[PDB]
């Protein structure tokens, strides 16, 4: 294995200004927040991950292999670390992800989201699979949930809390089979929970086996079930979802194959999905000094 030469940076608590809170519960506790790189003049909209108030050190451990894994990862389709603040406890920090998680922005805009937009979410999430793959990471939690809007037309993937390298050392609906039996985990796992993710979008966010509780899961899955197919979905869109949930994990798509695949269907978007009143799909920030405000994304460092 290559050197991780990526660069952990320490960020002074007092570089952040205006910070609501947006998301609570669980460990959670995530804020909207700015931060203002030194004296440098740009103020970056960012999000802020606490691992909850009380700072009891099993927390620690997890949420830093987190920082660790999202401070090695570049690429569009993957969110990355900015840096992370040692305050007395410890706090991640993420480009802003503006409209929030993909999950609740597709159950939210279920009538004005069109064919072109859910093939071409398809696309940009199995690149950032196919980018996690090259880097040799399983993200292990690969979910619409975990999925952030950085616009309606730009995607990434998110939440590396269980991020491990290939061959090293619990979401039952969106894993595996091989991985709720043996705890096997592969890029092919993630495949497998690729091909749910997918359904959840075709499907507006339904929840996956709605109903069956989590310990009948690998009993209906070993009868040979699964998710059933979307009502806008062509055969040959599920035909792929369907391929992602074979038994033998080698004959599941490839990222890259995936890429590829909704690639070609994202030209023809009516071909593949067929959605009421497609055509016609519309999609589309809180400060008078905006003057400064640049993305994540245009702010680079050496
Ligand atoms: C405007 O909304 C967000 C922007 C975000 N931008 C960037 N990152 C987010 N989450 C996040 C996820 C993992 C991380 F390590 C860090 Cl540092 C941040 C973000 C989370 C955001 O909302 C969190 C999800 C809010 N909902 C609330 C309802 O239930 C599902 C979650
Ligand atoms: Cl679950």
Redesign the pocket.
């Given at each position: 294995e290559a050197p991780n030469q990526a660069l952990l940076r320490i960020l002074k608590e007092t570089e952040f200004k205006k910070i609501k809170v947006?998301?609570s519960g669980a460990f959670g506790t995530?804020y909207?927040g700015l931060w203002i790189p030194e004296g440098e003049k740009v103020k970056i909209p960012v999000?802020?991950?606490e691992l909850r108030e009380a700072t009891s050190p099993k927390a620690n451990k997890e949420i830093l292999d987190?920082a660790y894994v999202?401070a090695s990862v570049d690429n569009p389709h993957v969110?990355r670390?900015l840096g992370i603040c040692l305050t007395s406890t410890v706090q991640?920090?993420?480009?802003?992800?503006?409209?929030?998680?993909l999950?609740?922005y597709v159950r939210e805009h279920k009538d004005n989201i069109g064919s072109q937009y859910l093939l071409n979410w398809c696309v940009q999430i199995a690149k950032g699979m196919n980018y996690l793959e090259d880097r040799r990471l399983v993200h292990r939690d690969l979910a619409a949930?975990n999925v952030?809007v950085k616009t309606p037309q730009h995607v990434k993937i998110?939440?590396?809390g269980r991020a491990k390298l290939l061959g090293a050392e619990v979401p039952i609906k969106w894993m595996a089979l091989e991985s709720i039996l043996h705890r096997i985990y592969t890029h092919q796992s993630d495949v497998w929970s690729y091909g749910v993710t997918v359904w959840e979008l075709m499907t507006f966010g339904s929840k996956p086996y709605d109903g069956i509780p989590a310990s009948e899961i690998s009993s209906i899955l070993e009868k040979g079930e699964r998710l059933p197919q979307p009502p806008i979905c062509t055969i040959d869109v599920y035909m792929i979802m369907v391929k992602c949930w074979m038994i033998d994990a080698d004959s599941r798509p490839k990222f890259r194959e995936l890429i590829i695949e909704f690639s070609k269907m994202a030209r023809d978007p009516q071909r593949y999905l067929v959605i009421q009143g497609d055509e016609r799909m519309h999609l589309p920030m809180d400060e008078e000094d905006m003057d400064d405000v640049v993305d994540a994304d245009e702010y680079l460092i050496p």
């Amino acid at each position: 294995e290559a050197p991780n030469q990526a660069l952990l940076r320490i960020l002074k608590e007092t570089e952040f200004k205006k910070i609501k809170v947006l998301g609570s519960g669980a460990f959670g506790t995530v804020y909207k927040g700015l931060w203002i790189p030194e004296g440098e003049k740009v103020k970056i909209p960012v999000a802020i991950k606490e691992l909850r108030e009380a700072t009891s050190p099993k927390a620690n451990k997890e949420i830093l292999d987190e920082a660790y894994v999202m401070a090695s990862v570049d690429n569009p389709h993957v969110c990355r670390l900015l840096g992370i603040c040692l305050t007395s406890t410890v706090q991640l920090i993420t480009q802003l992800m503006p409209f929030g998680c993909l999950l609740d922005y597709v159950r939210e805009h279920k009538d004005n989201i069109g064919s072109q937009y859910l093939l071409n979410w398809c696309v940009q999430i199995a690149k950032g699979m196919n980018y996690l793959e090259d880097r040799r990471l399983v993200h292990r939690d690969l979910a619409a949930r975990n999925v952030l809007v950085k616009t309606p037309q730009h995607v990434k993937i998110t939440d590396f809390g269980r991020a491990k390298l290939l061959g090293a050392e619990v979401p039952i609906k969106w894993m595996a089979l091989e991985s709720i039996l043996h705890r096997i985990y592969t890029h092919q796992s993630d495949v497998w929970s690729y091909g749910v993710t997918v359904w959840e979008l075709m499907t507006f966010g339904s929840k996956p086996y709605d109903g069956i509780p989590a310990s009948e899961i690998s009993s209906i899955l070993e009868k040979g079930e699964r998710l059933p197919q979307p009502p806008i979905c062509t055969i040959d869109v599920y035909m792929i979802m369907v391929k992602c949930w074979m038994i033998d994990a080698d004959s599941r798509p490839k990222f890259r194959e995936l890429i590829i695949e909704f690639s070609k269907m994202a030209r023809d978007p009516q071909r593949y999905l067929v959605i009421q009143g497609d055509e016609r799909m519309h999609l589309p920030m809180d400060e008078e000094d905006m003057d400064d405000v640049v993305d994540a994304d245009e702010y680079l460092i050496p």
